[PDB]
């Protein structure tokens, strides 16, 4: 698609009889805009992007009351889950959840998501149809029958097709100078000598948004994944991203090799080289 | 429904405390408390899921509730005011999301309980003119001088409650409309065939169940304590 | 922000006259709209639930429909037994739990049809007392209205329909009594428009 909105839940039990922790983060594409952490005296939902700040105290109470309720329910769920897998209170366990809507190349809903994991592995996921579930084992099937009796799938469909989409469009407009303004990467190639296998070429891409980018080294023959070190995309902190790919080995020369940058912020994919 | 509420009726005085009991449907784990003020809608007070408080509406600081581990709930209303007189409903939510309500609890709060009176009940036998003109016979029952409004009128023919041929006024009448604390009157009609009223073996009783002051308050007056009671009046068929 | 508006608050139908009850709603996200029926004294009774625009639920003379802004409860050929309050409630997606936000309701009264009216005023004497008495206005058509007395010593009840289903018979009647004796039944309902054919025995 073109744009997405996602909520990430992390429910974690505490070592013994301790009260579990509930965390929620909300994203629109790669921009985080809200947070909740149950581990505070009086936990409140907080803004994390400058465009969600215009929202009234009714918006913030709705959020806070949903996450304060999730805190109590995810606690019951963590206990239900350790029962399924016959685990003691001794250990700490994690329920993770990802839900959200993808707007279309137009801006209508492409598809909806609702995936859960237990201790970092898939447990239950809402199918593309937003009507059925994919359970991983017999324990996730206990959750499926609970969620079928509670009409969870139908209530996700209503949310994802409506509420989720309306608010994403709302945020997209309110933050259109950030969320709808693609930042092209600040690109340069650096030279890092060694005499023996000869020097190293580092192709940088800096201060770009969204996170989706592609860096390849073409000595002509094509993209050559084997001799390239492609470091994964990292955030700079200013809501922008960084990435580099390097090659070693002229086996030829540093000027034979050219870097290729693919990003939305570019009118056409770049052809970058090292300039001595 | 499956939800049970007790007491169905409560008459107390201002400044007092009351406790409303609720049992959700067997299988339901949640309790919702609603208030229905006279000629006003249902307002969400508080909700409990599995003994734990969840959502909170506009429940007053004076009011408190809780859900027990057996899932039953109790709503306590202290420092009672006249305006706290309403219908209190509890609902239990189904796994599929629908709420199911109880009969409710009607609380009437009064300044003093001195103006509380039971009804006097009288049965008025059918007119011979009605019997001759229509071949039908209507008994009229009058429940009068009762305060407050909590009354349930039933008709009992040969020991069995009848619903056919009967209609009792939905609302009672203020006897002294300007009083504001006016005593009430309530009429009911039971129409039977002239023939049915004609055989003397047929027995007709008008039952009025009054919900008064019981146990909750003290009675520092002359006349008998206007307790919750059934007051009745009867008639027998006339051969004529 | 959760508002449920029901219209009309009062509905006065003739038996057989179909009508549509409106329920306007504003919600963050619709989880479900509910129709309850409430009789006086008792608790709201579950009728049905609509989740999406274009969804239709039908239970007897009642049909409910949903839009993104409102819900209609269509009543076809109403009967006196349909007289009750119809409640509209909504469940929100943007809030936690299954709590319902209720509308104020549509108080419906279905005026019954009267097959063969025989308007008459009869005097009824007490089963115990000989002096104590009541005046019964009965068997009047569905268009006769009983007026109240300005005499504080005379009590006039409102109209009331009784069903002798054993004989497929329905009847209207109102009661009048006075604190002071020498109370004439021929004059007991003097304040109301009484049918010219009303029967007054000797």
């Amino acid at each position: 698609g073109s744009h997405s909105m996602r909520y990430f839940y992390t429910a974690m039990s505490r070592p013994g009889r301790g009260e579990p922790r509930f965390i929620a983060v909300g994203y629109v594409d790669d921009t985080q805009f809200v947070r909740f952490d149950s581990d505070a005296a009086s936990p409140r939902t907080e803004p994390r992007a400058p465009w969600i700040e215009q929202e009234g105290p009714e918006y913030w109470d709705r959020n806070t009351q949903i996450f304060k309720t999730n805190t109590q329910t995810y606690r019951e769920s963590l206990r239900n889950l350790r029962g399924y897998y016959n685990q003691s209170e001794a250990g700490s366990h994690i329920i993770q959840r990802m839900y959200g809507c993808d707007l279309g190349p137009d801006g209508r809903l492409l598809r909806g998501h609702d995936q859960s994991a237990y201790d970092g592995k898939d447990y239950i996921a809402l199918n593309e149809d937003l009507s059925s579930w994919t359970a991983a084992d017999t324990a996730a099937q206990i959750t499926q029958r609970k969620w079928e009796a509670a009409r969870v799938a139908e209530q996700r469909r209503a949310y994802l097709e409506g509420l989720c989409v309306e608010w994403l469009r709302r945020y997209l407009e309110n933050g259109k100078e950030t969320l709808q303004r693609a930042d092209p990467p600040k690109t340069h190639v650096t030279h890092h000598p060694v005499s023996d296998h000869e020097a190293t070429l580092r192709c940088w891409a800096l201060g770009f948004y969204p996170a989706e980018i592609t860096l390849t080294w073409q000595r002509d023959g094509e993209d050559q994944t084997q001799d390239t070190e492609l470091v994964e995309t990292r955030p700079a902190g200013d809501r922008t991203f960084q990435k580099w790919a390097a090659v070693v080995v002229p086996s030829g020369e540093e000027q034979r090799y050219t870097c290729h940058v693919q990003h939305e912020g570019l009118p056409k994919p770049l052809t970058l080289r090292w300039e001595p | 429904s499956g939800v049970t509420q007790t007491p169905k009726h409560l008459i107390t005085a201002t400044g007092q405390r009351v406790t409303l009991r609720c049992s959700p449907r067997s299988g339901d784990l949640s309790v919702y408390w609603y208030q229905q003020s006279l000629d006003q809608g249902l307002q969400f007070l508080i909700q409990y899921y599995n003994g734990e408080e969840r959502a909170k509406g506009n429940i007053l600081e004076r009011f408190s509730a809780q859900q027990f581990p057996d899932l039953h709930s109790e709503l306590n209303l202290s420092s009672l005011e006249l305006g706290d007189s309403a219908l209190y409903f509890c609902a239990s939510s189904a796994r599929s999301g629908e709420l199911f309500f109880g009969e409710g609890s009607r609380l009437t709060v009064l300044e003093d309980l001195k103006n509380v009176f039971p009804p006097e009940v009288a049965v008025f036998e059918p007119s011979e003119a009605e019997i001759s003109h229509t071949q039908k016979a209507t008994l009229v029952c009058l429940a009068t001088g009762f305060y407050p409004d909590h009354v349930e009128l039933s008709w009992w023919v040969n020991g069995k409650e009848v619903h056919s041929g009967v209609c009792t006024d939905p609302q009672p009448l203020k006897e002294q409309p300007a009083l504001n604390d006016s005593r009430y009157a309530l009429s009911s009609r039971l129409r039977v065939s002239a023939t049915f009223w004609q055989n003397p073996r047929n027995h007709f009783r008008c039952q009025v169940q009054f919900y008064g002051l019981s146990e909750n308050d003290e009675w520092t007056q002359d006349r008998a304590k206007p307790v919750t009671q059934i007051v009745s009046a009867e008639a027998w068929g006339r051969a004529d | 922000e959760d508002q449920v508006t029901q219209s009309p608050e009062a509905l006065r139908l003739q038996e057989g006259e179909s009508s549509s009850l409106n329920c306007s709603y504003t919600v963050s996200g619709l989880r479900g709209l509910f129709w309850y029926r409430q009789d006086p004294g008792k608790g709201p009774e579950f009728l049905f639930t609509l989740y999406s625009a274009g969804e239709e639920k039908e239970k007897e003379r009642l049909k409910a429909t949903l839009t993104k802004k409102e819900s209609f409860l269509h009543i076809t050929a109403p009967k006196p037994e349909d007289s009750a309050t119809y409640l509209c409630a909504v469940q929100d997606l943007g809030t936690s739990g299954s709590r319902l936000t209720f509308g104020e309701g549509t108080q419906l009264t279905v005026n019954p049809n009267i097959q063969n009216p025989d308007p008459a005023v009869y005097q009824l004497r007490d089963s115990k007392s000989s002096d104590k008495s009541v005046c019964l206005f009965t068997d009047f058509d569905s268009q006769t209205n009983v007026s109240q007395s300005k005499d504080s010593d005379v009590y006039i009840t409102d109209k009331c329909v009784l069903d002798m289903r054993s004989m497929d018979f329905k009847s209207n009647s109102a009661v009048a009594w006075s604190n002071k004796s020498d109370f004439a039944c021929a004059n007991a309902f003097n304040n109301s428009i009484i049918p010219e054919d009303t029967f007054f025995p000797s």
Partner: peptide, 11 residues
């Protein structure tokens, strides 16, 4: 805006 969890929404 997040979705609210209705009653009996537990794993």
């Amino acid at each position: 805006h997040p979705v609210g969890e209705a009653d009996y929404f537990e794993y």
